[PDB]
């Protein structure tokens, strides 16, 4: 489980849409929107939540969604909690008989899915427009 | 189909070289009038209308006025400019100005069409949330509390079956009875009351109208739009209709006909048909209804007529002024019209080539039942 | 007056609670607490082995019956008295 | 005299009907009233998925604290009689 | 088995309650005879023609077999199917209550249907076409200025505007222009009566 998050954060074929690679299909990702099927190809640029011609100023609901999307805390949280559950389940070999440590592990796995599942929801929410 | 090229032209000879509506109608009138006849084709391939400063007609009637041709049996519009200097017999076919546009796509409902009123991100996020709930309702109901963890009936497999029971709203076998068990059982109940109701509210929306509404069928929006350019045949009586408009929307039609860059007037009708097919909504063509009938009755079947006719003009058998044959010609047409001959000829060419042959007028009523083809998916 | 014409606003994150006004969702919650106390009151009311705990409806279960009955979901328990079924 | 003579015939009104309507029309001016239906988007129903996960984190919290309370280890009949006394007063 | 039959139920039942109040109030139109082929398969209703008429002289000169049957119906039919005026043929249809048909010209049958009481209906396509023409004696001097004048009205749409004016400004029945507009009502017990049965 710890592999498939840290792969998915550090890879960038998240979305197949059409958009500008320089500033027209996109090798679009969670951090770096990249581009395929163009005259220029293989250049990956930094993504940008845009305040220039924004049309969401003084929104209560969007200003929460801008922060959570482009600073993707929830898939980052879904890595660390999945990593923290990995250390408690690694610590059952040595320093065992504590008999509490895998519940402390297993809640961190279940939490890491609840972090992961809402990281999908904020991702589908923001890119729609 | 007024004159069509016969397949065996180089085999056959004379008037048998051609086959068409007028070719049949010429044979019918020559029986009743009793004259030998020899068909020809105009060299212009055009309709005779007037030159600037010259009045010399370039087309069939210019071959008819000037002693070259004797009888003109053709889809020739009886307009005032022609009849003041040629004769017409009484008309043989009724028609008017009408529009050809491409019906774009058929797009009947697929077999998994019932899943449509929710998007496929939602169904994916439902299944993720269904697993996400049922693992949490397991984890709560199985802790260190003799074997008093067993007092909760919720293993994980009863947990998947509870939340499936709560989602499909088909009741449930048991119920959580802890405090934190009833929280997850309560929230998932509030979840499924929104989602299943958002399904049934939106599926009522798909079950009245799921089709296409025609963009320019009112014919005043057709004159309106600057994206949808509209044209007609050059030196055609449709163009000659709008040059003397007295209706205000028809006054605006001629202005964009005049002020289109480049010329939307196409050199033939068949090339004008092929322009709208290439356009895909970008261009419209204006043509006669009986000329727009045969376009629908041929493959690729993607041409259809919107609105009624814009007017009511007619076609005529044409003769020169003072042509002595033209009066038994004129008595022939009233004989052919009453004997059902002309309608039978209007039948034959315009149905038997109904390769498309659909006659799909449409079940217009929005109070129409579900069909088994619409809900075939859940049985699969 | 001319202004730059605004964008057509998306619905909020609480768009589910829009078909019923704010004044009703407060009175649905108030009717919920009102029912579950009365359903707690009618049963578990000195019946005459020990009759004081014959019914299964505590205060906490009777909240769960009224929450279950509102969400169109069946529950395990049922009132089972002439004054409690009303 | 000519201004009214146009206006009483509605000529000026017909000329006002002609020019301000035949120009460039935005789409939501005459036929923008017509409506249509579409599938629900996840941005439309997103709060319900928040509240579900918002409830699941809460339920795991309360289930944890009843374990920390029970592994560590209470009303009195008198103090609730005082508590129903103060609550009736307020 | 149960889990899929649940999801089967969720789709079928929610599709059943989609437009259910509409189907209990369909308000169908029966239209028993249309499309002159089906005049000849349901020939028991009594046809009607005008005395001294082109509709007479058309069916007197019958050639198509569907057209020949309906006149050889009317000539031996009892009593005399002919009416002396249009107001006699219209009124004979209205009394007989779906039992007497009258075959008549397309524009009067357009006109009668528009005019209230509006209890009649124009069904079927036109079985031919034929024209009204302004007529002069053979060899008249006025024939040539009139023959040029007919198109000269028609190319301007004057005749069409005069046809737009007169056939629409008269008595309009309610279901002709604004009868398309709809509304909702409570369910009646005659709509749901089979469920109580
Ligand atoms: N079937 S059709 O509409 O092509 C059609 C149309 C017409 C036909 C005959 C047929 Cl088959 N003949 C009539 C004729 C009868 C008299 C009235 C008009 C001319 C002389 N002209 S029409 O009304 O234009
Ligand atoms: N039949 C028509 C063709 C051209 C047009 O439709 O304007 C004519 O003779 O004028
Ligand atoms: N207008 C018709 C009247 C007779 C009929 O309707 O048959 C005619 O001139 O002959």
UniProtKB/Swiss-Prot annotation, chain A:
Domain of life of the source: Eukaryota
GO CC annotation terms, alphabetical: AMPA glutamate receptor complex; dendrite; excitatory synapse; glutamatergic synapse; postsynaptic density membrane; Schaffer collateral - CA1 synapse; somatodendritic compartment
GO BP of this protein: neurotransmitter receptor localization to postsynaptic specialization membrane; positive regulation of synaptic transmission, glutamatergic; postsynaptic neurotransmitter receptor diffusion trapping; protein localization; protein targeting; regulation of AMPA receptor activity; transmission of nerve impulse
Principal subcellular localisation of the protein: membrane
TM region positions: 71-91, 102-122
GO MF entries: channel regulator activity; ionotropic glutamate receptor binding; PDZ domain binding; voltage-gated calcium channel activity
Cellular compartments annotated: Membrane
Swiss-Prot/TrEMBL keywords: Calcium, Calcium channel, Calcium transport, Ion channel, Ion transport, Membrane, Phosphoprotein, Transmembrane, Transmembrane helix, Transport, Voltage-gated channel
Membership in a protein family: Belongs to the PMP-22/EMP/MP20 family. CACNG subfamily.
Function: Regulates the trafficking to the somatodendritic compartment and gating properties of AMPA-selective glutamate receptors (AMPARs). Promotes their targeting to the cell membrane and synapses and modulates their gating properties by slowing their rates of activation, deactivation and desensitization. Does not show subunit-specific AMPA receptor regulation and regulates all AMPAR subunits. Thought to stabilize the calcium channel in an inactivated (closed) state.
Protein name: Voltage-dependent calcium channel gamma-3 subunit
Taxonomic lineage of the native organism: Eukaryota, Metazoa, Chordata, Craniata, Vertebrata
Originating gene: Cacng3
Curated annotation (Swiss-Prot), chain B:
Annotated lipid attachment (S-palmitoyl cysteine): 172
BP-aspect Gene Ontology terms: cellular response to amine stimulus; cellular response to brain-derived neurotrophic factor stimulus; cellular response to glycine; cerebral cortex development; chemical synaptic transmission; conditioned place preference; establishment of protein localization; ionotropic glutamate receptor signaling pathway
Induction pattern: Down-regulated in the pyramidal cell layer of CA1 in the hippocampus by global ischemia.
GO cellular component: AMPA glutamate receptor complex; asymmetric synapse; axon; cell surface; dendrite; dendrite cytoplasm; dendrite membrane; dendritic shaft
Domain remark from Swiss-Prot or TrEMBL: The M4 transmembrane segment mediates tetramerization and is required for cell surface expression.
Subcellular localization(s) per the UniProt record: Cell membrane; Postsynaptic cell membrane; Postsynaptic density membrane
Entry protein name: Glutamate receptor 2
Ligand binding (L-glutamate): 75, 77, 82, 237-238, 288
Function: Ionotropic glutamate receptor that functions as a ligand-gated cation channel, gated by L-glutamate and glutamatergic agonists such as alpha-amino-3-hydroxy-5-methyl-4-isoxazolepropionic acid (AMPA), quisqualic acid, and kainic acid. L-glutamate acts as an excitatory neurotransmitter at many synapses in the central nervous system and plays an important role in fast excitatory synaptic transmission.
Keywords: Cell membrane, Disulfide bond, Glycoprotein, Ion channel, Ion transport, Ligand-gated ion channel, Lipoprotein, Membrane, Palmitate, Phosphoprotein, Postsynaptic cell membrane, Receptor, Signal, Synapse, Transmembrane, Transmembrane helix, Transport, Ubl conjugation
Family note: Belongs to the glutamate-gated ion channel (TC 1.A.10.1) family. GRIA2 subfamily.
Annotated organism of origin: Rattus norvegicus (Rat)
Tissue: Detected in forebrain. Detected in dendrites of neuronal cells. Expressed in the pyramidal cell layers of CA1 and CA3 and in the granule cell layer of the dentate gyrus.
Residues of the full protein shown: 425 to 818 of 883
Source species taxonomy: Eukaryota, Metazoa, Chordata, Craniata, Vertebrata
Sequence ranges on the Extracellular membrane side: 200-374
